[PDB]
Amino acid sequence: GVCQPTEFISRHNIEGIFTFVDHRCVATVGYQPQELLGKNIVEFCHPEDQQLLRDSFQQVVKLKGQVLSVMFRFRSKNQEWLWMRTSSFTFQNPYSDEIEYIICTNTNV
Amino acid sequence: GVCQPTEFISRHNIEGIFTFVDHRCVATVGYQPQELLGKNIVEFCHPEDQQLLRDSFQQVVKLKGQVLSVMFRFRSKNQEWLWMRTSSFTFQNPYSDEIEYIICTNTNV
Secondary structure, X not given: OXXXXXXXXXXXXXXXXXXXXXXXXXXXXXXXXXXXXXXXXHHHEOHHHHHHHHHHHHHHHHOOXXXXXXXXXXXXXXXXXXXXXXXXXXXXXOOOOOEEEEEEEEEEO | OEEOOOEEEEEEOOOOEEEEEOOOHHHHHXXXXXXXXXXXXXXXEOHHHHHXXXXXXXXHHHOXXXXXEEEEEEEOOOOOEEEEEEEEEEEEOOOOOOEEEEEEXXXXX
8 A cells, every 4th residue: 555655745824935844745856844944835936837826825815715726847856847736725723713824735746 | 726625634643533634524525623533534434444444554653654545435424435545644753753643635536
């Protein structure tokens, strides 16, 4: 049942900064979580795809709890553009209903 | 870019108890997080698929950090068996490398 990884989950603040990444990012895009944490996801995005990815972040926060999916090229550690299909949605605190973070699942396609 | 959901992320203890579920579970399997949290995932598994799912949970902890993927039928709230493809892996504390959670991404096939 052993899988090689094909996706990783990240958490982001509303501006796009990585605040959590699981270790599958090493296999998927070549970076350790430590190399991504504190950086904006848009810094790893192909310049042509940056408005898509920005629009995704803006919209996911406007309709809290709605899921979006976007496709964009991600800069791997090995200096390749990797096509990524990322689903995004906000996670609300169960008690205040405020946005706690944006949850991204980033799949290499 | 709006997506209807057909996967959700859960976290589990080593025995399979749900300790986290995102709200996409409502669309995917019909339950609120509160209906899953504190129950074992095996309680929602078709009896014929229970040993596969047990074997998954046993092995993911043995090779901590390795990703596994299993297919099993999940009992939805609407009393239907839904085929689920679940990837599982343990998330390690960044400083001790001890297991903190099992992270499951549960996708309706």
